Amino acid sequence: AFTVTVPKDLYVVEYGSNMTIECKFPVEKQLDLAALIVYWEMEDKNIIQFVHGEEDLKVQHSSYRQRARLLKDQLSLGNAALQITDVKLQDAGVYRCMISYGGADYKRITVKVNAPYNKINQRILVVDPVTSEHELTCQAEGYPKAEVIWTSSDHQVLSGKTTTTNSKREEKLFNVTSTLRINTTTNEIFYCTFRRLDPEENHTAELVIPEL
Amino acid sequence: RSLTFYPAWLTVSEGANATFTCSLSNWSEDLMLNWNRLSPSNQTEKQAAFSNGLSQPVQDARFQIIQLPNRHDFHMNILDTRRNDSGIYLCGAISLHPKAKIEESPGAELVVTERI
C-alpha cells in the first residue's frame, strides 16, 4: 500500500544556510498531477499545500512566502523536496510531510539549527595601573550554549566569569560573555575558548597585553 | 476536531488480541484514518489506513481498524500479538479537502508479555 519514506529523520543545518528536506513516494512511469497532493507543515504553520499541479499561496503562512518552495521538478521521481532559504533558529523543530497519491501517508522530520561562535569580540582594559591588574573580555553569539575556558600562553586554565543571555539582533541566539581579571605584563598572550556541543566546537580568540 | 487514543497503557500476553480505541470528536466520509506505530527514533510508521468504508493493512493484516456504530470511534486491534508488537501507537486523521490537515492523537503504549 501507499507509504512515504524519509531518507533521513534528522537534518543538522548551519545558521544562514539553504536547506532541502525530502519525502519520497512511489511513482510509476508518468505522474498524475490531478491526484497528487503534497503538504508540508511545521508547528501548525502551513508551509506547502500543492494540489492540482500548483502551490496554494492562499493557505500558506505569510512568513514563508518568498523563502519556502516545493521543487516541482523532483515530483516526477517521487521526491517531495521542501527548500527553505536562509535557515534561522526559528526554523528548528518537527516538520511533517503528508503525501496523498492513491493512498496517503505522512512522516516527521527533525531540523536542528547550529550557530557557530565565529565572531569573537574582545576587550582589554587596565584595572589598576599600579598592580597591573587587567580585565580581559571575550564575547560571541552562537547556538547552543557555550562555556568559556580561559588559558594562559602556557596552556594553564584560569578562573574567568561567564554571563549568558539571549541575543537582540537575531533570536534564541545565546550571547556568551566571559571576563578574566588578572595581574599581567606587556606582550603576554591569553586565550579564550568557546566550547559548545551538538556537534562539538572549540573556537578560540587570542588576546595580547598592549604597551604603556 | 481532536483525537483520543486509549487505553493509555495496555498489556496482553503473547497470542492474545490487543484493542485500543481511536476516538474522533467528529467524523466524515472524506477523512482518512491512519494507524501508526512510533519508531525508537520517533518516526511514524503506517500499519493500516481506513477510508471509503474499508480498513486496508499496509503489510500485516493483524492490524485492523473497525468503525463502531458510533461512526466516530474506531477499534484498533492488533490480532494475535507478538513480542515485537510492543511499542507506542497512535491514530492520525487526514483531511484532504478543501484544506490538507493532519490531526494526531496522543500515543498509547502496548506491552506484550510472555505467552501464557
Swiss-Prot record, chain A:
User: What are the glycosylated positions?
Assistant: N18, N175, N183, N202
List residues in topological domain: Extracellular. Answer: 2-212
**GO cellular component terms, semicolon-separated:** actin cytoskeleton; early endosome membrane; external side of plasma membrane; extracellular exosome; nucleoplasm; plasma membrane; recycling endosome membrane
**Positions of the Ig-like V-type domain:** 2-110
Tissue expression notes: Highly expressed in the heart, skeletal muscle, placenta and lung. Weakly expressed in the thymus, spleen, kidney and liver. Expressed on activated T- and B-cells, dendritic cells, keratinocytes and monocytes.
Describe the processing and modification events after translation: Ubiquitinated; STUB1 likely mediates polyubiquitination of PD-L1/CD274 triggering its degradation. Ubiquitinated by MARCHF8; leading to degradation. Deubiquitinated by USP22; leading to stabilization.
Q: Its principal location?
A: membrane
> What is the recorded function of this protein according to its Swiss-Prot or TrEMBL entry?
Plays a critical role in induction and maintenance of immune tolerance to self. As a ligand for the inhibitory receptor PDCD1/PD-1, modulates the activation threshold of T-cells and limits T-cell effector response. Through a yet unknown activating receptor, may costimulate T-cell subsets that predominantly produce interleukin-10 (IL10). Can also act as a transcription coactivator: in response to hypoxia, translocates into the nucleus via its interaction with phosphorylated STAT3 and promotes transcription of GSDMC, leading to pyroptosis. The PDCD1-mediated inhibitory pathway is exploited by tumors to attenuate anti-tumor immunity and escape destruction by the immune system, thereby facilitating tumor survival. The interaction with PDCD1/PD-1 inhibits cytotoxic T lymphocytes (CTLs) effector function. The blockage of the PDCD1-mediated pathway results in the reversal of the exhausted T-cell phenotype and the normalization of the anti-tumor response, providing a rationale for cancer immunotherapy.
Protein name per UniProt: Programmed cell death 1 ligand 1
Please give the organism.
Homo sapiens (Human)
Q: Which residues of the full protein are shown?
A: 18 to 229 of 290
From Swiss-Prot, chain B:
> What results from gene inactivation?
Mice grow and develop normally but exhibit splenomegaly, selective augmentation of IgG3 antibody response to a T-independent type II antigen, and enhanced proliferative responses of B-cells and myeloid cells by anti-IgM and granulocyte colony-stimulating factor stimulation. Mice are prone to development of autoimmune diseases. In a C57BL/6J background, mice spontaneously develop lupus-like autoimmune phenotypes, characterized by proliferative arthritis and glomerulonephritis with predominant IgG3 deposition.
| Residue ranges that the UniProt entry lists as topological domain Extracellular | 1-116
Cystines in this chain: C22-C91
UniProt's post-translational modification comment states: Ubiquitinated via 'Lys-48'-linked polyubiquitin chains. Deubiquitinated and thus stabilized by USP5.
Q: Name one GO molecular function term.
A: signaling receptor activity
Oligomer status and interactors: Monomer. Interacts with CD274/PDCD1L1. Interacts with CD273/PDCD1LG2. Interacts with FBXO38; leading to ubiquitination and degradation by the proteasome.
UniProt-recorded name of the protein: Programmed cell death protein 1
* Organismal lineage: Eukaryota, Metazoa, Chordata, Craniata, Vertebrata
